[PDB]
Symmetry: D2
Subunit: 314 residues, 4 copies
């Protein structure tokens, strides 16, 4: 009768923010933190512990090492190099594949047999790498993917239509990055067709474009202003973690392995997927219009081309 | 029919962590953020907004200016200088009093008439300054005080006795800082007398001392390790914010103005107090044993002596 | 600096279940309960209070009278006759209109100036009566309407497609009752077209019909089995109450007054509407396909024809 | 990677109220309901399901049968006869021991191997019976016990001292019934000694007595007014369920087997106990003053005497 145990690997801006989300939300009762930078781990574990007395239910936070993964239920990896102003996520594949080779190896050696959730960029390729490196079933390796892009798209739409974000059903799919695409054929508020409504406005075409551009380029805009992003992804990671430990069968856009869905194979990419205690139950295959079909195929190809050139993946 | 509006002033490590706590907890539906550093604000407001679609209920985050305080319900101040390794919180007094004279003046000029909640150090003196600069009733000016020290004490006890932190009722009172004191006459788990039980262990006196030393010196230990603290205080600030907006009448240890309670006057200091939508309803006066009476009076005197020498005050 | 106060009028199966939902959810900090049956109220208020120490945040429950409505923020009406096996909700109109003339008059005489939320059946007509008897603006009078039908529709779809209910976006609009209609032009899971997918299955047309029939007739099925329904409606009432007190601007299907939207006027009927601290901010006008336009107009006419014949109205 | 599954046996006022709490609180993702009265089960399951779309996270509700207990994590028993005005809880032992013999037998036959939580009265004796009938470790059989009495005591004190119930730490221990006792040596608000404070008031001794009398006799007062109690116990049951599935190590007053604690053995009785995913981790042994020692011993003896006369327990 064990409790729920999360091991976080990588305790920088993103990891520590995710840790604080877990302390606020009490999704799990035990969190173990691993990082090369043991002193920052020490400092954050103490600071975090001091918040736990106000957590809705008990959360135990501790500094850990790889042996601690043996009975972990979820391993969350936020370790690695981040982009500078003027850099793309794909600009990181080389260094971060190096790092994941090491990390996932250390984890599997502890006899870990849970679920992986990865945030390190480029997240689709790193999720793919975690799947390949680990040998685990696809259901048990998840990338955060467009969990965050979808939230940004919803946030910008909630402002444009002046309603709660919870009342906007809208999705970004594809690469978590420059080839991502909005699913305008779906995006709605209680059935209001948002793109059609925007098009009716003056320079509506312009507004439709700005909403997508601000979605696609949000990471760049935040990095320009404060150097790094972390709250959005931390919250997105928390949301996925919740769907797993509360066994929800909730549909979320995450980075998932495709094996024939959307006519693509052998690539992790952002799609709606059913999430439960077992990880990804299945990819959800939605109708795409012609523009969406064309953009999704191009995104998959973009990712697959970069993967074919990554020597670490061979 | 207005919603609940918080203005954060000071969006650094502490302020932004508090803002993220509010995005996670959905205590209020509107958060406005002010800092001299407008670029950091723009960046944080964006990053935070992107978390809000997953908030339990709607939270709107925006960059603001003082004029936005006119109809604010709570102003939370986390602006100012922090301490370096080696420094105490009292070392910050002159610098942060000058800053508060400016901030509080700009807030009051907006016609603000809500509640203030202060974290800037030294927090007891700065809560007092906020009360005096603002002219507001004492019920409406709160310092975070020992909200955080009490949590640390509970956390260390919960490890020493191996139970949930929410099952430990234990309190730190006094200055948020070096003259703070544990209330061992009270500390208990379902009535287990924690000091008495600890004294029964091998080198129990030593354990009793180490638990308080690790509580008292936690800030220094964290700063040594990662340069500043922010999660504990953000969570404590969120707890107080919840007691207010959910009108709880919850008893929390915060920095409050004393006017006779504990035989002290004209000083903000950490004590249990009842918190509700109107702010501090009243200070709770608990019995202290002789050691605790001694230390509490010493803590009050220490703060009052510092206030007596402060040019701004 | 007032807290949030709800007065429940009608403490039967529905009212007491709603009260228990509020004790579980801590949406508001104060709940006052009125019923002619003062013994049941005394008994429920006690039982409920005993649950409150485990509520997420403070909830105070008490027995009240109309005078207690003076500073209430929300009055929720669940008082009146329910239907028997075999009866429709429209059968209740004359009896429950007489009751509302009395209740609403007693509330308004207390100087109440908040929001009304109505569950008594037939709920659309009784929300309309509440608006007219009270003289309050339409934003401040809400019927629960299809909040519950939409939930049932989502629940049955979530079983048909094997995903979380919160992952199904689907709506019932129109009368809360026999002329209600599914919005199949919208119903989707992450964009999966649910009617189209169902039509692809063996006897898909049949499944499509059975899903709506089980939605439309759910109340009758539950009443046949246990004599009355209460959990679904209590939960829906709590959802609406949350959207108000957390100022959400959330879109929910409730009974709202139409003044031109959907080409209908002078009728309360179930439609998506934006809900916040001020009540219904506005009705949301969504595109309906030809079948849905037909059925919605028929539902509106059905309600308006009944209102036209009602002596009290 | 299974989710969390609760089977409720007995779907009357108490059981159905507990079920509605679980739908509001989303403690677990799956609830199965068993009752002889299959029609009321059918009606409640439907009514409850229709609430689940607004649950914080997914809750699946269904009508079940004993075979469904095979992989249940928690079985909650609220089945059986309830008291009439003018009756005590011990007035039920005979009929309800009969019923538990049957129920627990049917459950164990399904190969259930989780935790039992019992509410049926008299709850201490019925928890003891569930332990004996089932053969399960004491850690895995819990009675609701004074979870409710403690809440009532706290509620009455919160009114007398005008603070949040969450800020009153106070406990009732002993039999869930007439021999229960307040722990005045402990009861406090942030260290304020409540009994001492009450004694300082005019007729303070009277008020101290009324507070206890209204605690002890609450069930009778509610039964006189509306015929049965159910919300308080449902909420108390929910609280215990939460401590289990969120693995809290929270101290709650519940009915637990004593094996030497408080100098008593072979009796289930209301005491503070540490609750986690494994059930009762341990009884918490607090100092009692002389009056409390005397009353607790008498309560244990009262229960043990009645057990020795219950032929069903032999
Ligand atoms: N998926 C998303 O939506 C998203 C959003 C923002 C950032 N990111 C990515 O997440 C990653 C982390 O970003 P950040 O801002 O937290 O960076 P950071 O520099 O703040 O933290 C990186 C952490 O990784 C640790 N680390 C490096 N190698 C390690 C190893 N081999 N083993 C254990 N720990 C190791 C470092 O010590 C450091 O603590 C970056 O790749 C960034 O691109 C993803
Ligand atoms: N009460 C506690 O438990 C506790 C805990 C930790 C820190 N603190 C105190 O909190 C304060 C903030 O700490 P931090 O780590 O966030 O510091 P930080 O350096 O990260 O941030 C300080 C922020 O204050 C802003 N600021 C300075 N003057 C301003 C002004 N006049 N108007 C608007 N903004 C102004 C700065 O621009 C900066 O954004 C420090 O005094 C620290 O000692 C208190
Ligand atoms: N909107 C929906 O989805 C929905 C669902 C279920 C029931 N309902 C309706 O809710 C209403 C209540 O149903 P119920 O099962 O709780 O009925 P019930 O018989 O259990 O309770 C009705 C309560 O109304 C009280 N009452 C009658 N007149 C009163 C008055 N003048 N002043 C104060 N109290 C008065 C009665 O004393 C009783 O306590 C019925 O009209 C039912 O049709 C609506
Ligand atoms: N522990 C507490 O704090 C507390 C509080 C209130 C009530 N109770 C007790 O809880 C029990 C239930 O009370 P209630 O008000 O819900 O009673 P109720 O009559 O409303 O419900 C009893 C249910 O048990 C079912 N049942 C009877 N025998 C069964 C069997 N053999 N198998 C499966 N189901 C069976 C009945 O069909 C009925 O649905 C009573 O013993 C009451 O004394 C305990």
């Amino acid at each position: 009768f064990k409790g729920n145990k999360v091991v976080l690997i990588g305790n920088g801006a993103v990891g520590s923010s995710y840790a604080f989300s877990l302390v606020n939300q009490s999704i799990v009762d035990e969190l173990v933190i691993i990082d090369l930078d043991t002193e920052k781990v020490r400092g954050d574990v103490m600071d975090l512990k001091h918040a736990t007395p106000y957590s809705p239910t008990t959360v135990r936070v501790k500094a850990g090492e790889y042996s601690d993964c043996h009975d972990a239920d979820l391993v969350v990896i936020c370790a690695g190099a981040r982009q500078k102003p003027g850099e793309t996520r794909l600009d990181l594949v080389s260094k971060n594949l190096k790092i994941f080779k090491s990390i996932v190896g250390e984890v599997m050696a502890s006899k870990f047999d849970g679920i992986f959730l990865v945030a390190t960029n480029p997240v689709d390729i790193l999720a793919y790498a975690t799947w390949k490196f680990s040998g685990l079933p696809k259901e048990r390796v998840i990338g955060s993917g467009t969990i965050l892009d979808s939230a940004r798209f919803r946030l910008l739409l909630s402002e444009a239509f002046d309603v709660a974000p919870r009342s906007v059903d809208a999705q970004i799919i594809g690469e978590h990055g420059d080839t991502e695409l909005p699913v305008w054929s779906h995006a709605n508020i209680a059935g209001q067709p948002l793109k059609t409504l925007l098009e009716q406005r003056p320079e509506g075409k312009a507004q439709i474009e700005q909403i997508f551009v601000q979605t696609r380029d949000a990471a760049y805009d935040i990095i320009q202003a404060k150097g790094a992003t972390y709250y959005g992804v931390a919250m997105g990671l928390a949301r996925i973690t919740e769907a797993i430990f509360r066994n929800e069968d909730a549909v979320l856009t995450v980075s998932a392995l495709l094996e024939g869905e959307y006519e693509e194979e052998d690539v992790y990419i952002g799609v709606p997927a059913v999430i439960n205690r077992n990880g990804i139950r299945n990819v959800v295959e939605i109708p795409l219009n012609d523009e969406e079909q064309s953009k999704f195929a191009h995104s998959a190809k973009t990712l697959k081309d970069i993967m074919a050139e990554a020597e670490e993946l061979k």
